[PDB]
Design a protein around this nucleic acid. Structure first.
Lengths: 81, 92, 91, 79, 97
DNA sequence: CAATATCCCGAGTACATGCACAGGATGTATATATCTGACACGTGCCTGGAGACTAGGGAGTAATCCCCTTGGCGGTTAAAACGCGGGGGACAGCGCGTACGTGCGTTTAAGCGGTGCTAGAGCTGTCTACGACCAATTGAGCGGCCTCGGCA
């Protein structure tokens, strides 16, 4: 895959920011926030793939990512488990 | 094969408290997750409590303690006062 | 002046939609998994369950980041605030 | 009252280990607030593990288990 | 002869950041944990080593809170710590609000 | 340059530690065991691919002044250092709990047969909620009429 973190386009970061309650966003927040999101994805999808490899599956499934989240103190309600 | 869920007891309890009201399916999955998260936390803490005291069983007191640790505040003294209704009725 | 930026707050705090475009986020998660194993397949609900957890982390970080900009008497958030909010949080 | 025996210079020592140069006079009576609540939250659990086992002295293991529960583990007194 | 304000504060850092000894007096902290305990169960007793594991955990909490507080004061251009700093640190770590 | 301080080196200092010892409880060792689940076999689904198209968004730019940023501000205390107070620190013993052992007998697990609760079924069969549109309201700014204060 090419460079797909650039697909978290600047306006989308502003939407997330706007939800969070902030008025004014310096231009260096965009390239910092992509950095934070890529580090979070790495540390959850690694666990989700290790739960997958244990079961001899190829397809990653919703319970794998939910168990991956559950161990990091970041439990998600909505997809079971 | 059957899949099993708590989905009917949460609905049954909803009609206990809001007789006109209902739940959307996506908002059922929340209760069906929440209710089994609190199951696991009680089971896990009650299990450790038996182990620390080198018991094998898990009687009522091995759970009433696990609730009185795990719940934050008024919910502890309410849930303890609620569960001691249930077993007191059952043992008659 | 300075009012339309504030009008957006009252919009996005009322809606509960997902705020990142779906396909661009899905192709990023396929990229990040390739260095863990080649030729995964992702279940369509797994990709959603990532997105729902990401947005809920990002928006929690901007809530905790703004508090730092207020502390410095500013309005504008800056990377030094994100850095503080992550260091003090223990990331 | 017994909480005022967490004397001003003791707070300064704790602070000095933490690396702070200069301490506002409002920090003394405020810091006591955070110590008093922290002790409140682990003694509730330590006396809970005590009352469970019917004994009526708090042991080192009780305060270890209370601290372990809240994510503030100590290696020292019995892991 | 008399040093400059600042000189002795940095001398104290290099002292208490090199020792590992306990910083609160024993008896005054032992009185405090008894008073907070008797509000929850009357006529307790403590083992002599239980109160030590309280103290060694408290000091290590206080010292961590200050280390995370100073980070706020430094960010806010000051060097002096003030209550408004602790309220920020303790809110981002999710303890109080 | 003077002074307080940290650094450094050797004497003299209890006990801590590492060890040797007796001995006990448990890890081993062998034989037996079924059954977990490994493995093998197909079942059938979705994960994926692959197209056509609009319209939403995204990116870009332009103009600009808000907000940040900086300097210089004036005002008051944490720090410094000392004097100065009482309080944290080191021994004598009581007996109460904790442990631990004994015999306390409550309940669970298991295997038994019967049976009704639940959870997958529908187009169920609608119709709450979901857009779609209309209508009201307030508020703000721009014209317009009219007393009076400073000037000929």
């Amino acid at each position: 895959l090419r460079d797909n973190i650039q697909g978290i386009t600047k306006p989308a970061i502003r939407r997330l920011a706007r939800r969070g309650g902030v008025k004014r966003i310096s231009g260096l927040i965009y390239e910092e926030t992509r950095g934070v999101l890529k580090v979070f994805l790495e540390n959850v999808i690694r666990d989700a793939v290790t739960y997958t490899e244990h079961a001899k599956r190829k397809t990653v499934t919703a319970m794998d990512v939910v168990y991956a989240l559950k161990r990091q103190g970041r439990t998600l309600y909505g997809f079971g488990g | 094969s059957r899949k099993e869920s708590y989905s009917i007891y949460v609905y049954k309890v909803l009609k206990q408290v809001h007789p006109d009201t209902g739940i959307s399916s996506k908002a059922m999955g929340i209760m069906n997750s929440f209710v089994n998260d609190i199951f696991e936390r009680i089971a896990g803490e009650a299990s450790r409590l038996a182990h620390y005291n080198k018991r094998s069983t898990i009687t009522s007191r091995e759970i009433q303690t696990a609730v009185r640790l795990l719940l934050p505040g008024e919910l502890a003294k309410h849930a303890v006062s609620e569960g001691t209704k249930a077993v007191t009725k059952y043992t008659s | 002046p300075g009012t339309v930026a504030l009008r957006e707050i009252r919009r996005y705090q009322k809606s509960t939609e997902l705020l990142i475009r779906k396909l661009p986020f899905q192709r990023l998660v396929r990229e990040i998994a390739q260095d863990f194993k080649t030729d995964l397949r992702f279940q369509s609900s797994a990709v959603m369950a990532l997105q729902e957890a990401c947005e809920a982390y990002l928006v929690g970080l901007f809530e905790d980041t703004n508090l730092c900009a207020i502390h410095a008497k500013r309005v504008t958030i800056m990377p030094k605030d994100i850095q503080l909010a992550r260091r003090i949080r223990g990331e």
